[PDB]
Enzyme design. Structure first.
Site, PDB file in Angstrom:
ATOM      1  N   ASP A   7       0.848  -1.188   0.000  1.00 54.66           N
ATOM      2  CA  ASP A   7       0.000   0.000   0.000  1.00 54.66           C
ATOM      3  C   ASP A   7       0.885   1.241   0.000  1.00 54.66           C
ATOM      4  OD1 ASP A   7      -2.077  -1.835   0.233  1.00 54.66           O
ATOM      5  OD2 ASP A   7      -3.175  -0.622   1.686  1.00 54.66           O
ATOM      6  N   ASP A 123     -15.326  -6.430  -1.664  1.00 52.98           N
ATOM      7  CA  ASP A 123     -15.388  -6.659  -0.223  1.00 52.98           C
ATOM      8  C   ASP A 123     -16.659  -7.416   0.110  1.00 52.98           C
ATOM      9  OD1 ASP A 123     -13.044  -5.260   0.081  1.00 52.98           O
ATOM     10  OD2 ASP A 123     -13.975  -3.474   0.949  1.00 52.98           O
TER      11      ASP A 123
END
Ligand code: NA
Length: 231
Positions: A7, A123
């Site tokens: 990230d 998700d």
């Protein structure tokens, strides 16, 4: 395969639970590839918060600096976003919330760029009834569509790559979805805390295992993860 992940915020490698792991993403990625990684994953958190500040120059450098395909996500909301990442040299663009919010628009992207260029990142939280609910983020409510329903929306335009994160057993989820759609290569994300967690996914049908924080934390190496995956 194992898919090592970073990230990125303004050039910085960060751990998400934010912890600063330094400004050396390229040597980190190079060492992942050196250990046998065949695919890498990047999340552009800066671009996710403001697409105008998408880290295209950094992404360009990173892609150029390794010899393996990189899939990149983070606030990919428009056709222009997809095009810009591909032009920068990304192998695949990871689409999240836009794939839930505007499916006709994203179906057009499949037709334009091809299914091999796109990864849909979904998700999932398992609700009270046991349904795999899609949500656009961990902190927003369910969006009213199931994983199965959304996958079946995109099958007609040749959906091939889906990254599934459980934000609500973990094994059962992947076993179920992979069995139902054997023509899709699913990637798992989340929940990898140690080597045993990778072993647990081996027989489920998942094609790719995203591993981020466990590598940053030095729990195991990419080489060890691959040896486990191949075993
Ligand atoms: Na991890």
């Amino acid at each position: 395969m194992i898919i090592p992940a970073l990230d990125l915020i303004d050039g910085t490698v960060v751990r998400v639970v934010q912890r600063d792991y330094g400004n050396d993403p390229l040597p980190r990625l190079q060492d992942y590839a050196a250990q046998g990684a065949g695919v890498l994953h990047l999340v552009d958190l800066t671009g996710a918060k403001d697409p105008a500040k998408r880290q295209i120059p950094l992404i360009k450098t990173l892609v150029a600096g390794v010899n393996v395909p990189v899939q990149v996500g983070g606030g990919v909301r428009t056709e222009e976003d997809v095009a810009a990442l591909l032009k920068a040299g990304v192998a695949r663009v990871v689409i999240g919330s836009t794939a839930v919010k505007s499916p006709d628009v994203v179906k057009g992207w499949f037709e334009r760029f091809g299914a091999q260029a796109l990864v849909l990142a979904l998700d999932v939280r398992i609700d009270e009834h046991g349904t795999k609910q899609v949500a656009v983020s961990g902190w927003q409510e369910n969006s009213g569509v199931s994983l199965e329903q959304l996958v079946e929306t995109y099958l007609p335009v040749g959906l091939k790559h889906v990254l599934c994160t459980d934000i609500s057993s973990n094994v059962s989820l992947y076993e179920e979805v992979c069995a139902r759609y054997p023509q899709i290569a699913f990637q798992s994300s989340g929940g990898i805390g140690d080597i045993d967690d990778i072993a647990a996914l081996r027989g489920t049908g998942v094609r790719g295992v995203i591993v981020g924080r466990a590598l940053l934390e030095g729990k195991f190496t990419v080489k060890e993860a691959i040896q486990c995956w191949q075993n």
